[model samples]
Target: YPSVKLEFVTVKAGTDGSIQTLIPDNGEALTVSKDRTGSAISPNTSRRVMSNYETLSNGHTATAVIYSLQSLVTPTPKPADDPTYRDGLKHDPVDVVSIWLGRGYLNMILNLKVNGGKQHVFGIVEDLSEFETNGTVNMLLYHDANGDEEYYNRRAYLSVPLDKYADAENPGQKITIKFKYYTYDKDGTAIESGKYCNPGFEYVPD
Candidate 1:
C-alpha cells in the first residue's frame, strides 16, 4: 500500500467524462479514478475538502484515489448586524500557521492551544460595522476554546468561502480582505490589542 498524504483540495467532477478530480490548493489537479462519493457532497458542486490520498502511477498527469475526504468547515459569513453578533463574537486566539487564497476559498492552517479534552469550536464571521469603519469587508475568526487549557498545540484546517464577496461589475476584481483574531504568541500567551491588529490582504476572485 502507498503512504497516505493529507492535502486541502477542491473536489469537483471532471468535464471530460472522468470521475471527481482533486485540485490541491498547493499542487496540480489529480484525476481520481476511485471516486469517493458521499451524501453530503454532490456532483457538480465544487467543495473544499481535506483529503488523505495515495498517488498512483499514471503515465503523466498523475491519478489518485482518496481514502477519506472531510469537507472543510465552511460557515457562511455570519451577519454582523446589531443584536445578531452584538457585543462581538468569541475572540479566543489561535496562531495562524498558514493562510492563502485558492479554489475560491481562503484556506488556512491554524495552530490552537488545548488540553487533551473536548472539542474546541471555531469559525469565521463577518463584521459589517467594521466594514463601514474601514471600507473593507471584515471577517473575524471566532474560536471558543470551550474552557480547554493550553496544555498542548493542535493544528486546525479551515476555509472561508469568498463567493459572496465577489464583485458583479468587475469580473477579475481584486478585493482587500481583512480578518480579526485575538492575537496570541505561538506559546499561547495572549497579546494586547494595541500591540497588533489584523493586516489586510488582497484577494482576486476567479
Candidate 2:
C-alpha cells in the first residue's frame, strides 16, 4: 500500500491478490519508519510504529528485488473438458494471447507499476518526443486474470490499454498509448526520476 507507511510490504490482505507489492529499487531490510503503533503498543503513525521495531533483535524493513511479473488471462476456452485445467502459463492455450480487454476489476492492468495493494505506480511514463507512426512505451500491465508473482518482473507476457478503454477484442492490433507517470516522494510529494518513458505496448490491430 503506497498510501500506507509500510515499505517492502507484500501489501496483500491475501497471497497473490489483484494488487501486490514489488521489490523497491533499493531492496533491503533497513530500519524503516513504516509502522505506526506505539511502545505500549503505542500507535503514533504507521511509520513510527514500524520504525520502533528497530529496537527488536536485528529488526529490519521488508524489501526484495522482484524477479518476475507474470500476467494471467481469463482464458475463454482451453479444452474445457479438462476439469483440472489451469492456464496463466501464458501458453496461449485456448486464447490467452487473444484476451478480451475492457472495464471492470478483472479486465485490465492500466499501470504495470501498480501493486496488488492499493498503490499506483508513481514514476516516469514515456514522453512524446517519440511515437512516430505508432507508439511503444516501457511499462508492465497485466491482463488481471489474477496470476501469481510467477512472472515476477517478467515482460513479454502482459499488455494494457494504451489509451482509452472500450468493451471489445482488438484482434491482432497495434496501439499507441500516451504515457504519463505520476512521480512522488516519501511525503507523497512530486518528483522527477530522470526518466521520460520507454517503448510502450505495440498496438498492431490486425
Candidate 3:
C-alpha cells in the first residue's frame, strides 16, 4: 500500500462553530469510505420499511451507512534508554490518527510506530480533572496497529470526563493528554516504559 505522512493539529473553532482555516501540510489526501452491506431492512414484503428507516410525510425514509478509510497515520519512533548513549531507552513514537469531540464518547485513534530495535505497546494517560476543566466528553485511547484494540496500562488514567476541563481558558489552561509506551519481552512481559506529553492540544473545541 502507498503511504503518506501527516501531522494532526487542533484547529480553532469560530463563534459560529466553523473550524478555522488550516494550512495543509504536504501529504496525500485522507480519503474516507463506507461499507453499507449490513444495512437493516424488514424481510418479506417489498413495500415493508426497515427498522433503520423513518418514513417522512412525503414517503421518503432516511438511511445511514458505515464506511472505513484505507489510510491511517503512522507514529514516529524515538530513542530509548542506552547505557552507552546519552539518550535513555525508548519505545515507538506516537501520532494522532483521528479525533472526534462529540457529546457522547469522545474517540481518539493513535498510530504506534514500530521499529526493529524493540517491541512495544501504547495507551493513553489522562487526568480526570483535565476533562472537568474543559468539558471533555470522555477519553479513550485506541490502538490502530493491532486490530484497533483498546490497551489498558496499569498506570493509565481512564475515562476522564469533559466537565473537569471547564475552567480552562487559554492554551496554558488546557489539560494534558500523554502517550505511554511500554517495552515488552518476546514472551509478552513488560520490561520498561516512557511517556510523551501533549497538554494544550487535547481538548481544543474544534
Number of the predicted model whose TM-score against the real structure is largest: 1
Off by over 4 Å in 3: 1-60, 67-91, 98-100, 114-121, 127-206
Tell me the tens digit of each residue's lDDT in model 2 across 55-78. 233244343222222223222212
Candidate 3, residues 1-206, lDDT tens digits: the string is 11322222222223443322221122222211222323322332111111111112324432222221121222222222223223323233244444444321233444443433332433333334444565332222322233333243211111213443445444444444443444345676644333333332254432
Q: Looking at candidate 1, what is the lDDT of residue 111?
A: 78
Worst 10 residues of 1 by lDDT: 190-199
By lDDT, the candidates rank as 1, 3, 2
Provide TM-scores for the models: 0.72, 0.21, 0.27
RMSD of 3: 15.8
Stronger candidate by lDDT (1 vs 3): 1
Q: What is the lDDT of residue 43 in candidate 2?
A: 26
Model 2, which residues run further than 4 Å from truth? 1-132, 135-173, 186-188, 192-196
Report the Cα lDDT for candidate 1.
0.68
